Design an enzyme around this catalytic site. Structure first.
Site, PDB file in Angstrom:
ATOM      1  N   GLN A 193       0.672  -1.267   0.075  1.00  0.00           N
ATOM      2  CA  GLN A 193       0.049  -0.051   0.020  1.00  0.00           C
ATOM      3  C   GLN A 193       0.959   1.346  -0.028  1.00  0.00           C
ATOM      4  O   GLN A 193       0.356   2.152  -0.305  1.00  0.00           O
ATOM      5  CB  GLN A 193      -0.886   0.019   1.114  1.00  0.00           C
ATOM      6  CG  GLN A 193      -0.210  -0.046   2.423  1.00  0.00           C
ATOM      7  CD  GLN A 193      -0.963  -0.717   3.748  1.00  0.00           C
ATOM      8  OE1 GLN A 193      -0.992  -1.843   3.762  1.00  0.00           O
ATOM      9  NE2 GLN A 193      -1.064   0.054   4.828  1.00  0.00           N
ATOM     10  N   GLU A 230      -3.628  -5.804   1.624  1.00  0.00           N
ATOM     11  CA  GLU A 230      -4.582  -5.097   2.356  1.00  0.00           C
ATOM     12  C   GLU A 230      -5.632  -4.603   1.390  1.00  0.00           C
ATOM     13  O   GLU A 230      -5.325  -3.647   0.788  1.00  0.00           O
ATOM     14  CB  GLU A 230      -3.917  -4.223   3.250  1.00  0.00           C
ATOM     15  CG  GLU A 230      -3.118  -4.617   4.373  1.00  0.00           C
ATOM     16  CD  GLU A 230      -1.864  -4.549   3.728  1.00  0.00           C
ATOM     17  OE1 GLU A 230      -1.238  -4.747   2.616  1.00  0.00           O
ATOM     18  OE2 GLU A 230      -0.594  -4.273   4.496  1.00  0.00           O
ATOM     19  N   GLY A 272       5.250  -1.590   6.063  1.00  0.00           N
ATOM     20  CA  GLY A 272       4.337  -2.289   7.046  1.00  0.00           C
ATOM     21  C   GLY A 272       3.918  -3.720   6.029  1.00  0.00           C
ATOM     22  O   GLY A 272       3.709  -4.915   6.649  1.00  0.00           O
ATOM     23  N   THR A 273       3.834  -3.774   4.671  1.00  0.00           N
ATOM     24  CA  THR A 273       3.815  -4.896   3.811  1.00  0.00           C
ATOM     25  C   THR A 273       4.627  -4.803   2.708  1.00  0.00           C
ATOM     26  O   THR A 273       5.070  -5.970   2.433  1.00  0.00           O
ATOM     27  CB  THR A 273       2.308  -4.893   2.975  1.00  0.00           C
ATOM     28  OG1 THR A 273       1.291  -4.688   4.126  1.00  0.00           O
ATOM     29  CG2 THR A 273       2.010  -6.121   2.612  1.00  0.00           C
ATOM     30  N   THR A 299       7.378   6.992  12.554  1.00  0.00           N
ATOM     31  CA  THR A 299       6.161   6.442  12.634  1.00  0.00           C
ATOM     32  C   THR A 299       5.847   5.154  13.177  1.00  0.00           C
ATOM     33  O   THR A 299       4.704   4.676  13.596  1.00  0.00           O
ATOM     34  CB  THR A 299       5.423   6.623  11.377  1.00  0.00           C
ATOM     35  OG1 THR A 299       5.875   5.700  10.334  1.00  0.00           O
ATOM     36  CG2 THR A 299       5.496   7.983  10.688  1.00  0.00           C
ATOM     37  N   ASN A 333       3.750  12.817  -4.744  1.00  0.00           N
ATOM     38  CA  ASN A 333       3.806  11.819  -5.714  1.00  0.00           C
ATOM     39  C   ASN A 333       4.291  12.322  -7.109  1.00  0.00           C
ATOM     40  O   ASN A 333       4.770  11.632  -7.790  1.00  0.00           O
ATOM     41  CB  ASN A 333       2.308  11.127  -5.683  1.00  0.00           C
ATOM     42  CG  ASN A 333       1.992  10.705  -4.231  1.00  0.00           C
ATOM     43  OD1 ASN A 333       2.801  10.573  -3.415  1.00  0.00           O
ATOM     44  ND2 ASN A 333       0.682  10.689  -4.088  1.00  0.00           N
ATOM     45  N   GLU A 346      23.929   1.637 -18.634  1.00  0.00           N
ATOM     46  CA  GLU A 346      24.807   2.488 -18.744  1.00  0.00           C
ATOM     47  C   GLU A 346      25.172   3.256 -17.340  1.00  0.00           C
ATOM     48  O   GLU A 346      26.207   3.425 -16.679  1.00  0.00           O
ATOM     49  CB  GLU A 346      25.023   3.598 -19.845  1.00  0.00           C
ATOM     50  CG  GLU A 346      25.155   3.127 -21.252  1.00  0.00           C
ATOM     51  CD  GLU A 346      24.360   2.246 -21.636  1.00  0.00           C
ATOM     52  OE1 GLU A 346      23.067   1.800 -21.030  1.00  0.00           O
ATOM     53  OE2 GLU A 346      24.550   1.247 -22.625  1.00  0.00           O
TER      54      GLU A 346
END
Ligand SMILES: Nc1nc2c(ncn2[C@@H]2O[C@H](COP(=O)(O)OP(=O)(O)OP(=O)(O)O)[C@@H](O)[C@H]2O)c(=O)[nH]1
Ligand SMILES: Nc1nc2c(ncn2[C@@H]2O[C@H](COP(=O)(O)OP(=O)(O)OP(=O)(O)O)[C@@H](O)[C@H]2O)c(=O)[nH]1
Ligand SMILES: Nc1nc2c(ncn2[C@@H]2O[C@H](COP(=O)(O)OP(=O)(O)OP(=O)(O)O)[C@@H](O)[C@H]2O)c(=O)[nH]1
EC number: 3.6.5.-
Lengths: 438, 427, 74, 49, 427
Positions: free
Chosen positions: A11, A71, A144-145, A179, A228, A254
């Site tokens: 996720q 998830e 976490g995953t 976190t 993002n 390269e």
């Protein structure tokens, strides 16, 4: 020909795959339906998309990426989103149980019965492709995953396919912000498992990305989307060599050969200079001079490393846009004459230039700049070992008082693997000053 | 999919679960009759986490009511949501408990555990894969402690791979009504610490003070207090049913809150509580929520951790937030009181953000805490138990019930061990 | 009335939700009560404006005519 | 013209399946509407007796 | 085409048949006057299996009512559907019963067989091609035992090539009311085993328990119990009358249920049983039907087969379902209790799917089983017969009509043989 397959694990790595593919669909003009207007670009799936999409005889662009997660929540909205018809249903590899931030749970308990399906996915993609230069693995050390699950597959794709490249992108854990406190557990496990199999690992930190937002982008309240797009623009630029051409064209092979000096250590840094707000680019001007100064300025990098605290080895600049070598080689010559920049005497030259004539373009509803001249800055310096030096003193205390051990040993694991990592990082760090010491 | 089956234990849990369950059905928008009014897509989707769907657009609550006294159940059944509660889920005994733990643990429980196990398993195959269970009861309740200690024992061997959430209320520290209450709690906690994996600790006295602080309403109802704790318990359950980038699983949470197995007792924390005039004298901002979130007075669980220090902190934020405003404030609170944490663990904060606000209020949050403030709690009962056990007051009943002094000896010895372990790790 | 027992201790909702919505010139009207952090990724419709004014793709048709078959050999 | 024809008939075939799907969900709830009505009348006939 | 003609005997079967018959008419929708209100083509199409048609749209039942006491018949004739039955079909004798097996078996039956055999061969000539006969009676009923045992012997030689279905009820084990009943049972079950091919075993004590279980209405009428048992017989007959890829013939089922000749005694099994609130608290799904279908509490015939094992199990499902869910539910029970069948035969399940749902509900089924739970039944009567045969109580009556202890010796000796026979092949 020139194509690859991207991997988005966890996720954590899902929305970036969306945003980049959303970004990627814009410059190609990919409509949300999945087809072009009446104009002719379709066929046997062989055009600008053929490196990235698979717009087969049926006429629908099929992205060459597989989204793996455990998830089902996050994958369920995105398959109900806007581009879901473009996404293959079961390349969005979903799972029914999380790894619970546990690296071993994501590597042992559940990864077994799904990888064979995933192995079935990659082989179906392997047969249809032609050149398949490598893979684009998007993940996270503090997964976490992403952490546990990617570790198994990257082992399995290595043993069957050990002759192609594997490109790794991951958010690096925040140095002082945590976190999660199991994050030091899995991240150290990821590194020791990957250093002997991962080809090229590229890392980044969000807090510095945030700092840029309210330094020059002038955004005190950004979102994920802004972040993002930035990293999405970063991977877009490195893939622009594949999508466009230039004065000269450079490929990941390269990069790998020229970037990594010696085995093990394969961890350079990425930077994009023309990060600026819309109004600044409006009444100011961009040229090769200032952007090169910006790209080497110690505070414009997204990793908490002080360059004057270390020494430079690798320097790769990817000029995407309208530039000419005349001012380029002159400007970088001044950079060589610069005294603060301390390259190692081992490499007389460490400079990899990539010219692309296409200017980077704004995205609808975006916050980026209006770029005619851009550089994708790939560099490696000795100022990085302190991150793991930060990691180990974080790790040694919490290992000494054996925090959370009842959890991990409860699911059938032991300390011997954890002991392995501490000297491995000790081995990793001691190489770093050994290559540091001339 | 992963779901939860709930247990209504003890006569307080009768008030607890009744308020708790309506607090769920309402904000999914189902009428009291049970015909869901299709309004929100996401709640239409993630209703299956707690309810199964019967005919007629009616989601059956997957909960079980247990008691001994019919009148409490009849009042619940005659309530506005008795019709959404099931007769088969209504299981009960033919006896008056006498508010006796041992009778509810050895005598009356013997002929009722069979049926409830049959009942609870029937729902077990009805669902596919649970995260676990949660139990609303009291540690100070006679029938609830008698029943609950029995059930938590039995459910452990059958399904030792699930989440055994426990929701219990601590009686008034000043004045405990039941005079044999210290005996009941001491017996219960002995098995609780051995069986539970999590424990919610709530006290009535702090709830009354909160009324004196922010409610200011002088004369509320006990149901209003149930409404508060249900809202807090609802907040922690928002994670699982709601989408948005926050990791919901209690196991994603439990490993983050539990450093060592003996740590099971945790304290709640809630977000904006507002009085009459401040409702329009409050500018809802993440800091002022955060300031109010971390206030010694907005504590409601047991007592002030000002006496001790902080082990771990975890807050879930419900509404349209972002990563930054929670980021700097954690740095702000980190630097505000850095020393009052424990040097054993840095970065002991674990944050989650729910992008779906509650129905009507936008900027909200919930806090779960594990500090060094429970020493006062069980040390309090330590003088009590030792005092009554010094001269074995109120004892001929339990010996007639078949109990002996020996069972208490290790039970207090276990409790004294928890006194040291909490003290050793922090002090 | 979509109220439990209104004026309850925690904050409550009374207004009709079906009218709490706003739209953008490049999107549809959406429920403000239920706007998620993930739906922004494709919320807006595109304009022919935020598109590059140049396109220089790589054309490989002449390549594949000789890729599909082996090269000449003696 | 092979491709344009094969592609156009597809969404036609697509158009055909949700319309029988929506026909499927509408008819089942009518019986669901019917059964609750029968559950409504049985309660009220229990009333007079 | 292949049809069926019914036999109504015994003062019990006088009650059941009317209840059975009125259900079928209500199933098919014929008014009490007899003028079918045509609404379903298929029930119109396949009403010929049991009924002939008079003038003017009147379906005459092909059933035979026989008894000795008029008041029962007068009550039956004055019933809601007595007008549907024929005075031609009302045959009786000129004597009271006295609840004696042999008086109807040797004295009264002698001058009454001639009449009924003439009647049953008249209706035999009326119909073209038969599956066979079904008989509704009791084994503990004096008039039904005497006449039934007589007629089953007589019907064997006249048509030994048909279906000799028998529907009998076992008297209550705790009390038989009739104290001479164990004599009556032993005599009848002796004659039954040689002449019969099918036997339905039903006991009323389970029916009272079921009333407390799911009916929950405390005080029912015995006719309601008839409404229960008639539904069991209706469902097994829905196979023949209704379309769908279910193989309906009893011979199709008999060779499937009967491994060996002496196996005549069988238990029914019925599908969803629902209480006051559960009608709208039930998620009617094939898994939960099979659960309730395979519930030891749903047992109604004799007792729990838990004490023994399962020889043959066969359940017919009625409604709009599919092969796959019944197939997976079929394989679940194999995995559920693999050890509780016999290693003699695996895959001991026979399944038939009636696509035609009943009138009043859609998802339904009926179960026919041959388990090893009948040992307790006749072994119970074994101690009964031995103790009463020990001192020949109440014997001067039966010696009066012309009987001897020698007939009792072989009847129980035959009974003892079947006691062993059930024992050896399972144990
Ligand atoms: N790559 C990525 N990282 C994120 C994103 N959002 C937050 N993060 C950071 O990346 C981490 C996400 O990792 P995990 O929590 O382990 O996610 P996971 O491994 O897929 O498993 P879960 O805990 O169930 O979500 C968090 O610690 C955040 O600090 C995101 O959208 N993408
Ligand atoms: N339902 C309810 N319980 C309350 C209330 N106020 C305090 N309580 C306490 O909640 C406790 C838990 O109830 P139960 O566990 O069901 O108690 P019990 O086993 O039936 O026996 P007792 O504790 O003596 O009542 C009780 O012991 C009460 O002391 C209230 O207003 N309503
Ligand atoms: N009709 C009817 N029969 C019942 C009921 N309960 C038990 N039975 C039994 O069903 C048996 C069958 O009736 P018949 O075969 O007609 O009885 P019979 O040959 O006239 O002689 P008896 O058995 O003594 O009545 C009776 O013996 C009763 O004992 C009931 O509620 N109604």
């Amino acid at each position: 020909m020139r194509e690859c397959i991207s991997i988005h694990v966890g996720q954590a790595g899902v929305q970036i795959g969306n945003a980049c593919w959303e970004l990627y669909c814009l410059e190609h003009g990919i409509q949300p339906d999945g087809q072009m207007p009446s104009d002719k670009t379709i066929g046997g799936g062989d055009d600008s998309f053929n490196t990235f999409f698979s717009e087969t005889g049926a006429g629908k662009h099929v992205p060459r990426a597989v989204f793996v997660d455990l998830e089902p929540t996050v994958v369920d909205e995105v398959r109900t989103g806007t581009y879901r018809q473009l996404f293959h249903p079961e390349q969005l590899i979903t799972g029914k149980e999380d790894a619970a931030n546990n690296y071993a749970r994501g590597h042992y308990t559940i990864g077994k019965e799904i990888v064979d399906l995933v192995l079935d996915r990659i082989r179906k993609l392997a047969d249809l492709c032609t050149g398949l230069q490598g893979f684009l693995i998007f993940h996270s050390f503090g997964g976490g995953t992403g952490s546990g699950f990617a570790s198994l597959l990257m082992e399995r794709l290595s043993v069957d396919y050990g002759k192609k490249s594997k490109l790794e992108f991951a958010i690096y854990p925040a140095p002082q912000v945590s976190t999660a406190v199991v994050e030091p557990y899995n991240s150290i496990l990821t590194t020791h498992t990957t250093l002997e199999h991962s080809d090229c690992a590229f890392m980044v930190d969000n807090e510095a990305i945030y700092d840029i937002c309210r330094r020059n982008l002038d955004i005190e309240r950004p979102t994920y989307t802004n972040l993002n797009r930035l990293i999405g623009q970063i991977v877009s630029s490195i893939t622009a060599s594949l999508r466009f051409d230039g004065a000269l064209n450079v490929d990941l092979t390269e990069f790998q050969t020229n970037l990594v000096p010696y085995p093990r250590i394969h961890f350079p840094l990425a930077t994009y200079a023309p990060v600026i707000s819309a109004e600044k680019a409006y009444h100011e001007q961009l040229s090769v001079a200032e952007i090169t100064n910006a790209c080497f300025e110690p505070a414009n990098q997204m990793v908490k490393c002080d360059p004057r605290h270390g020494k430079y080895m690798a320097c790769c600049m990817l000029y995407r846009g309208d530039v000419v070598p005349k001012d380029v080689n002159a400007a970088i010559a001044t950079i060589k004459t610069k005294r603060t920049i301390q390259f190692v005497d081992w490499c007389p030259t460490g400079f990899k230039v990539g010219i692309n004539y296409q200017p980077p373009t704004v995205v609808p509803g975006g916050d980026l700049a209006k770029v005619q001249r851009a550089v994708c800055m790939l560099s490696n310096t000795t100022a990085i070992a302190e991150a793991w030096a930060r990691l180990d003193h974080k790790f040694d205390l919490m290992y000494a008082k054996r925090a959370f051990v009842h959890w991990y040993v409860g699911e059938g694991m032991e300390e011997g693997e954890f002991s392995e990592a501490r000297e491995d990082l000790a081995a990793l760090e001691k190489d770093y000053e050994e290559v540091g010491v001339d | 999919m992963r779901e939860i089956v709930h247990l209504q234990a003890g006569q307080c849990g009768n008030q607890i679960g009744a308020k708790f369950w309506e607090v769920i059905s309402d904000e999914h928008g189902i009428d009291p009759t049970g015909t869901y009014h299709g309004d929100s897509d996401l709640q239409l989707e993630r209703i299956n986490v707690y309810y199964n769907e019967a005919t007629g657009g009616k989601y059956v609550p997957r909960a079980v009511l247990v008691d001994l006294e019919p009148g409490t159940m009849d009042s619940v059944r005659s309530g506005p949501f008795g019709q959404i509660f099931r007769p088969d889920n209504f299981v009960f005994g033919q006896s008056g408990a006498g508010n006796n733990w041992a009778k509810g643990h050895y005598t009356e429980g013997a002929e009722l555990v069979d049926s409830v196990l049959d009942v609870v398993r029937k729902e077990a195959e009805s669902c596919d894969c649970l995260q676990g269970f949660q139990l609303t009861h009291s540690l100070g309740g006679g029938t609830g402690s008698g029943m609950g200690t029995l059930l938590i024992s039995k459910i452990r061997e059958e399904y030792p791979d699930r989440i055994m959430n426990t929701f219990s209320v601590v009686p008034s520290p000043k004045v405990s009504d039941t005079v044999v209450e210290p005996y009941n709690a001491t017996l219960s906690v002995h098995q609780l610490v051995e069986n539970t994996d999590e424990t919610y600790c709530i006290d009535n006295e702090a709830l009354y003070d909160i009324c004196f602080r922010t409610l200011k309403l002088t004369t509320p109802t006990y149901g209003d207090l149930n409404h508060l704790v249900s809202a807090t318990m609802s907040g922690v359950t928002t994670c699982l049913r709601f989408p948005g980038q926050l990791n919901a699983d209690l196991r994603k949470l439990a490993v983050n809150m539990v450093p060592f197995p003996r740590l099971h007792f945790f304290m709640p924390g809630f977000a904006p509580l507002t009085s009459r005039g401040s409702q329009q004298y409050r500018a809802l901002t993440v800091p002022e929520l955060t300031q109010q979130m971390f206030d010694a007075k907005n504590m409601m669980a047991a007592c002030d951790p000002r006496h001790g220090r902080y082990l771990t902190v975890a807050a879930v934020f419900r509404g349209r937030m972002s990563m930054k405003e929670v980021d700097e404030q954690m740095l702000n609170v980190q630097n505000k009181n850095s020393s009052y944490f424990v040097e054993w663990i840095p970065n002991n904060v674990k944050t989650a953000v729910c992008d779906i606000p509650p129905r009507g209020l936008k900027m909200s949050a919930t806090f779960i805490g594990n500090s060094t403030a429970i020493q006062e709690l069980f040390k309090r009962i330590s003088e009590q138990f030792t005092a009554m056990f010094r001269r074995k007051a109120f004892l001929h009943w339990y010996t007639g019930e078949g109990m002996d002094e020996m069972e208490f000896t290790e039970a207090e010895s276990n409790m004294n061990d928890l006194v040291s372990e909490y003290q050793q790790y922090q002090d | 009335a979509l109220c439990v027992n209104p004026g309850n201790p925690v904050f409550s909702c009374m207004l009709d939700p079906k009218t709490l919505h706003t739209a953008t010139s490049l999107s549809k009207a959406q429920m403000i009560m239920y706007k998620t952090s993930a739906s922004q990724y494709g919320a807006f419709s595109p304009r022919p404006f935020f598109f590059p004014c140049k396109f220089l793709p790589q054309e490989q048709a002449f390549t594949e005519h000789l890729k599909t078959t082996g090269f000449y050999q003696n | 013209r092979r491709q344009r024809e094969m592609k156009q008939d597809f969404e036609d075939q697509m158009a055909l399946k949700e319309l029988i799907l929506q026909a499927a969900k509408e008819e089942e709830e009518t019986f669901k509407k019917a059964m609750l009505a029968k559950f409504a009348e049985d309660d009220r006939i229990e009333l007079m007796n």
